[PDB]
Amino acid sequence: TDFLKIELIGRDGSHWVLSGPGMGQQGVTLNPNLQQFYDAPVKTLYVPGPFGEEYAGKRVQRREIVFSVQAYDEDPDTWSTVDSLWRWAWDYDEESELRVSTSDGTRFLKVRLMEEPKPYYEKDPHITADNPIVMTVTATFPYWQDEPEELIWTTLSTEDMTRFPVRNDGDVPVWLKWTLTAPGLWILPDFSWGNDMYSRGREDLGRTVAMPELVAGEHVSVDSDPRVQTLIAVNGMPTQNRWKGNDLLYPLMPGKGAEIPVQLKNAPEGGACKLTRPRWYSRPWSRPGV
Amino acid sequence: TDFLKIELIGRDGSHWVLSGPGMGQQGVTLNPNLQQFYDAPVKTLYVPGPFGEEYAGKRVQRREIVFSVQAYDEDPDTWSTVDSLWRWAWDYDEESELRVSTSDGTRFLKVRLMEEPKPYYEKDPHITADNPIVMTVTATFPYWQDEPEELIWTTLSTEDMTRFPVRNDGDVPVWLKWTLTAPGLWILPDFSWGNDMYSRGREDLGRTVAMPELVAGEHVSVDSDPRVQTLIAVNGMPTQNRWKGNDLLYPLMPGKGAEIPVQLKNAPEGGACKLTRPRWYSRPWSRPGV
Amino acid sequence: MLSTGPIMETLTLTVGSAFEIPGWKLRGEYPAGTTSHLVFTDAAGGTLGEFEGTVSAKEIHYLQAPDDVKNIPHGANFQLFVTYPSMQPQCLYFGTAIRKEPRYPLSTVVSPEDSAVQYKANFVGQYIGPMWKPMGNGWGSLGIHTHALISEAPSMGPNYSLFSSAAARWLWSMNMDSVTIVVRVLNVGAGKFNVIVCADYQMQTYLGIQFETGISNNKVHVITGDGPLNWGYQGDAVNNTTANGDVYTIKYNDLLDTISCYKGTSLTPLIEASGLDVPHGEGFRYTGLAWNTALLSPGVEPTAWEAKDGV
Amino acid sequence: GPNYSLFSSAAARWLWSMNMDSVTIVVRVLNVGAGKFNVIVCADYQMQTYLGIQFETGISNNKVHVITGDGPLNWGYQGDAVNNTTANGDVYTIKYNDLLDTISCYKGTSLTPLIEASGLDVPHGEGFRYTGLAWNTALLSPGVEPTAWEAKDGV
């Protein structure tokens, strides 16, 4: 249909249109009955309680998409070329993009081969030159993504301050990344946005964390994502040792946003701050919510 | 049918009529074969005995409701809007209301997503614009409930007494809630109602327990249900710390009712009390039980 | 089913649209003088609407202006009665009114960020409480002093068993940049007492009014933050002799960018400063107090503290 | 202000409503010409009946009035007029106090009421808690207009 378009960007940069307008132009179409494709798999925890069991939280699970494609062509030789190209588009170690475009925009999913593909029918594939490949791909990051938003603030002053406009339009919290130049002392916002997972949802409404003083050449990447270390110095110096136990604890809660304040002090040559805000969704398409 | 109406009030405040008069106006109808919807799941316990096994008691279990809805519209774009709104009407962390209205009144169940919804058919849903969403919701509190019955008694005397008419017309025992002003010493009833759970059924027929002497500004809520702490002050004072291990032990058993007495002493201003009696039921509809 | 009964039905309402029930839906045979009325009530039974139908020979027609139904909420329960001449009313339909219209949740709901706050503290219980976070000298740096020798209420100050200076940050933040602080204070010795507004999370930068008292140093300063225990004087000082039980109002007006202090019930600022280079906005709405004395005895300390959004 | 390309007098209402009768409105304004600027308190959902404080800037009418509204763009005056000159960046605080049934306007930092009125006959309570602004100019150029506006519930 023209309302929904599905593409694959392979690990080698190949572009395939599996469904929607222009489907099958590269020889591969998408078969029905694809699972764990729309909603992000979330498991809920329950603990014993007075009236049965009590809700104890949720955990999101990695996506396991089992889907079939059909590689077709008129002649067996060119069909074999198409099938080989489709196989070359995938890998186990490196991920490839699965992009869904609808009236709500384009959202992609990084998927990798979970196991070996199951190709062809029971007979010789060159007989039909039109054969199905069963793909069991997995999404380690289970959220459909849009391109993250990047904001740059450069100042020539020794001490300055800026307001970064930030807003989570998705249905899941997101973790911000900062790229801070050196030298200089930065103060970054760690607003709770009312999130109360450290029992400080109201106490940390306007929380700001002061990064350790940066010496020349110690440009830092400050990522709030739990998957990566918060402070990473580009030159390898241990900069988290001068941080005295302080950390960025809170993500950007859905439906929340403001002009978060970023402060720079003691910067003999100014400074540059880059804010990257991811745009994560649990569905390939959804209307905006607020 | 006009004998039964089923509505959903989502976590966002949206209102849907799945079944009954006016069903499908918002685009979503209720498919047949919904399970664990009527009777509260209860498992009984048995110990070994000379004649096989002996009854040991019962425990009520949380509801694991599995039901399908059908989202429909004439055009795929409006269908997409309807599907997105239906998805927005649900969550894992917070519960949406599910109301059933019959000649017995309206009873609501609070339900949350137990796992990710399973939407659409094998092919893309824009072909049909009429697709089913299978939903596995859960009720942590498994009893259907109505709006609780509330009574208020205020006084100006230093010492006073009152009688509250109370009657459980439902299927299951209910736990009373009290709101008591301060200052003043309250004596609240904890009648056994003949319940032999502690082997004190008629020893505790007229049991009354004295709350600790409340200081000025320390208005308390005394909720007898086991889900929540019994005594909680509104000024944050640790009231139950002054209660020497006393507690309210007995729910209002079904079919039981009386004029329970409330006593107030040492109240220079003269305080007020409020009694809340929940109306819990094990079934969406049932004739009143004497 | 021996007796006649109503049919559970539903009504549809829309904002800006005329509520109308077509005649062919309310069909039947109606003699002359028959009257139909529709009653809308709420969860408590209170009648929130009543309308009269246009009963004809064979149809009943309802048509009301949108302003007549704009007050009827979704979930309000209706009851439609028909009344034949020389007879009691007979309910034909009953049910619920659903609203088929765009839904505006943000109009009805009010976010916690969009709410003026008002905080109060009196220290009469002789305990610090969980709402004050010590600053500068760490945990346990605050204390309560009774002042039982004079007829005065307890006041908060530094823990003079360990420190001679301290700060306290009110645990929660304000929701507006403009803020009003009202402090009833006692002057029992020499010292400096700072009322701090527009503070950050760690009270590194803030505006403040400093009341300094001493042998010959009774004055009021406007200070900026250099840390919870350090400050910088802005502008000139104003002489002010603080007495026991004196009430001072520190108002910061954001649109005027002006922090002023009024003594007692004076309509003119005792002190005033404008255009200070201090960050303002989200993350810069915490408030607090600070004390600094040369000797290990109370100086100027607040018996009563109050804060409110806006000026 | 008004879009002077096709309009001269224009009124605006805040989308949301106050939750209590008493209210405070802090407005920072500019005087780039001659005209009238009304801060509107206790209005209905159509701004038919309301209290207001009107700042008039002109050659001979550099004044402030207390106004009672008859429609969003038509109003009448109550009481005298207090002389007042408005400069760029002037901050005015219009407080309606329900306990005293009074409407007052203060200028700058001083707490003395620049203008005051009491006992005015307007409805209050639910449905009359809407605030707003109004601009009325004879010419097609900006007069006195707000650069900053803030509302707080209660006084």
Add this chain to the structure above:
Amino acid sequence: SSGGGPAVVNNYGDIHTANYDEFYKGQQRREAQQQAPILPVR
């Protein structure tokens, strides 16, 4: 659907796929956590 298949096998608990090796190792780890600090250094 769920009632009467793998979804009730999950209620049954460790009837289908479940190994003894990690269960024994976990029991040993719990006992080691309990007893290791109080075991003498000699």
Add this chain to the structure above:
Amino acid sequence: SSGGGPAVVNNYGDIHTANYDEFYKGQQRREAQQQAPILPVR
């Protein structure tokens, strides 16, 4: 044929027929082999 039946149940491992008493006795025997020669004779 093999994939999807008992031939993959074998890959699953000890999901179907597998006994607890024999596994426990084997673990006890391994521990006894480990610890018996170092236990004292007293």
